[PDB]
Amino acid sequence: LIKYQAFDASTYDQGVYDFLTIEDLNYGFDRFWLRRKMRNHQGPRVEFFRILFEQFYHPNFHD
Amino acid sequence: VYKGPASIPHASAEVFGAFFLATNTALLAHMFPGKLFGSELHVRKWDPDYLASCCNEQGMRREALSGKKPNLWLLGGGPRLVNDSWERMWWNNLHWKRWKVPRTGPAFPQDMYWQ
Amino acid sequence: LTSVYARTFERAAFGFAKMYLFCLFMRVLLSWFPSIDWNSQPWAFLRLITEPYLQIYRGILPPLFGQLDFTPLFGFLILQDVVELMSSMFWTTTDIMCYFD
Amino acid sequence: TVAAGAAIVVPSGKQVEAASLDIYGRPPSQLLPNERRAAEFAAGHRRWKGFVDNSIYSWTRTLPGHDNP
Amino acid sequence: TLRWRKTLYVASLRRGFRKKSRKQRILVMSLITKPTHSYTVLGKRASRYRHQIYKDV
Amino acid sequence: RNEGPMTWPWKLMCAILYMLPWVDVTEKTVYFVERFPAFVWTEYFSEPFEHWYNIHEYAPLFIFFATYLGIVRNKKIPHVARYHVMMGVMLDIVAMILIVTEENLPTGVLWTPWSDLFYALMFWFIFLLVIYCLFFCFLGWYCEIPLISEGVYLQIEQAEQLGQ
Numbered sequence: 001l002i003k004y005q006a007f008d009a010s011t012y013d014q015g016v017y018d019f020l021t022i023e024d025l026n027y028g029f030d031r032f033w034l035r036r037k038m039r040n041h042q043g044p045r046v047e048f049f050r051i052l053f054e055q056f057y058h059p060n061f062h063d
Numbered sequence: 064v065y066k067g068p069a070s071i072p073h074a075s076a077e078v079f080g081a082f083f084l085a086t087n088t089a090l091l092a093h094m095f096p097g098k099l100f101g102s103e104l105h106v107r108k109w110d111p112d113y114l115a116s117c118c119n120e121q122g123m124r125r126e127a128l129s130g131k132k133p134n135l136w137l138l139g140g141g142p143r144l145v146n147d148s149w150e151r152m153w154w155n156n157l158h159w160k161r162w163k164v165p166r167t168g169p170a171f172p173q174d175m176y177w178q
Numbered sequence: 179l180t181s182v183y184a185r186t187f188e189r190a191a192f193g194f195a196k197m198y199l200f201c202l203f204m205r206v207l208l209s210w211f212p213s214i215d216w217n218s219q220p221w222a223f224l225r226l227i228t229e230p231y232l233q234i235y236r237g238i239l240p241p242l243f244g245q246l247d248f249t250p251l252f253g254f255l256i257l258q259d260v261v262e263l264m265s266s267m268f269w270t271t272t273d274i275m276c277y278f279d
Numbered sequence: 280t281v282a283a284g285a286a287i288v289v290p291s292g293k294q295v296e297a298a299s300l301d302i303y304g305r306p307p308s309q310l311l312p313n314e315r316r317a318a319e320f321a322a323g324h325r326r327w328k329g330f331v332d333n334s335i336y337s338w339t340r341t342l343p344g345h346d347n348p
Numbered sequence: 349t350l351r352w353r354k355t356l357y358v359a360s361l362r363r364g365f366r367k368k369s370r371k372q373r374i375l376v377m378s379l380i381t382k383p384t385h386s387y388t389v390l391g392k393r394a395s396r397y398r399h400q401i402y403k404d405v
Numbered sequence: 406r407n408e409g410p411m412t413w414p415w416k417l418m419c420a421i422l423y424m425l426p427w428v429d430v431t432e433k434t435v436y437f438v439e440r441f442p443a444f445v446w447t448e449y450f451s452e453p454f455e456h457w458y459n460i461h462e463y464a465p466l467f468i469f470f471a472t473y474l475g476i477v478r479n480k481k482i483p484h485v486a487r488y489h490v491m492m493g494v495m496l497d498i499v500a501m502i503l504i505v506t507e508e509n510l511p512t513g514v515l516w517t518p519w520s521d522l523f524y525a526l527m528f529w530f531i532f533l534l535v536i537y538c539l540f541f542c543f544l545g546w547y548c549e550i551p552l553i554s555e556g557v558y559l560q561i562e563q564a565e566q567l568g569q
């Protein structure tokens with residue numbers, strides 16, 4: 001979101017939202033997923049699913 | 064082992080320790096109202112508008128019981144003697160009253176949300 | 179069998195290497211403090227496990243200043259990095275395989 | 280500088296009457312407070328421009344025409 | 349929409365185009381020749397599907 | 406050994422050298438300002454400092470070598486100014502230690518809000534240290550940080566005889 005000041009730090013009743021929504025700025029996995037380049041380190045066929053199964057287990061996919 | 068000339072003041076490490084712990088505790092107390100042994104942290108006792116309204120109430124009541132026409136005292140200041148606009152004439156009290164919501168505060172969220 | 183054992187060996191070596199980086203990190207950070215007992219138990223064991231490696235290289239850095247060597251830090255950082263390697267980036271579209279270790 | 284400038288700038292009563300009587304139609308002490316300050320400023324600005332014209336600019340214009348870019 | 353995705357993030361190329369001319373594939377054991385360039389797990393479409401799956405997980 | 410007080414040009418130079426650790430932690434400001442908007446001015450203050458400290462890759466190493474070899478060991482400069490220069494260098498080293506720590510976090514912790522808390526605490530701790538030391542630099546006094554200032558005194562008295 002490099003062209004904008006892509007955070008919301010607003011006050012009392014002055015919040016304004018135009019194509020950057022409230023949920024994208026400050027709610028949950030939308031806000032978390034928009035900031036994923038903070039957490040890059042700095043094959044694709046089989047190891048992707050194996051690492052996702054071992055690391056981030058969830059019964060709606062893996063059970 | 065040489066610290067300095069001893070005529071220049073040295074601040075102790077306890078001052079910084081108290082400053083560090085107090086800033087962190089103030090932030091934590093502002094984020095969680097109701098959990099300070101069941102209470103919260105305020106930065107004042109009375110609203111200035113509330114105090115001035117009480118003082119104006121008692122002042123005009125005492126003026127009225129003494130047989131005079133009562134006067135309202137204005138926060139910020141009285142009128143300017145102009146002739147071009149109403150807003151310029153009454154600018155000082157308007158300037159006090161326009162700042163009401165940030166004077167009341169706070170500038171941080173009043174309730175806790177977990178990201 | 180070979181794949182499981184190879185993965186287990188890689189994980190164990192990576193963990194041991196990260197631990198040794200932590201030990202070297204401790205060496206630097208304590209080398210800031212001069213009035214230590216290097217004798218006392220905790221310190222003795224740390225020196226021990228770091229005894230030989232710093233003992234390997236105390237001949238390249240001249241005794242310019244006897245106070246401190248950061249050199250093991252750069253050395254082993256680059257070493258585990260090569261371990262990643264010897265084992266910006268322009269793509270066609272955003273690659274997902276770059277968020278894995 | 281502040282007092283030295285204020286010696287140049289601050290006008291007397293005759294300049295204030297002079298600056299009031301041409302800008303406005305009325306003599307002084309018959310005006311609003313905001314429109315007295317306009318006459319005072321006009322008198323002070325006239326004093327500044329007159330001082331700059333007769334005391335700084337009378338001898339610095341000897342025409343050394345050069346040093347363009 | 350497409351307009352919103354265009355207004356948020358652009359590619360910011362810096363090393364030329366990310367997309368390139370497509371390479372047809374043939375199989376070794378209608379009127380129109382259909383594209384078979386994406387019959388691989390290393391292509392752009394497999395990357396987009398894999399990225400969506402990771403986001404869901 | 407000069408035991409005189411600080412004067413204003415030393416205070417100005419020390420304030421710029423104190424702006425260096427803020428530049429090294431200024432990426433993580435958004436994770437604190439989101440919760441406390443009254444400090445939103447800290448998002449925008451350090452921008453030309455960020456530009457000038459990154460004119461060359463070798464600029465901060467040159468700054469560290471120049472300050473250590475030309476200010477700290479030079480005994481003609483008053484002792485409190487050398488104290489504040491070495492305090493700026495130590496705060497820079499602490500911030501670089503924090504950067505090294507955040508680049509080695511495990512991938513499970515990195516995809517939780519615990520990483521957001523870690524980012525905010527990084528910025529806030531460096532900011533508190535910088536504000537405290539800048540206050541006592543503008544006063545002209547010594548300020549003693551626990552576990553830091555004793556090493557600063559030892560390094561000054563070591564760098565001084567670093568000749569004989």
Ligand SMILES: CCCCCCCCCCCCCCCCCC(=O)OC[C@H](CO[C@@H]1O[C@H](CO)[C@H](O)[C@H](O)[C@H]1O)OC(=O)CCCCCCCCCCCCCCCCC
Binds near residue numbers: 451
């Ligand atoms: C009548 C005219 C009206 C003028 C109003 C003037 C307001 C005066 C505010 C003065 C305070 C600002 C200081 C100047 C900042 C210098 C750097 C600057 O320009 O940054 C300019 C930056 C703004 O940065 C700009 O931002 C833009 C975003 O749209 C763009 O990014 C620009 O590139 C960027 O330059 O502003 C600051 O960061 C402001 C920080 C101010 C806070 C400093 C903390 C210290 C506060 C004072 C301490 C008082 C202590 C108590 C004293 C007791 C006495 C009361």
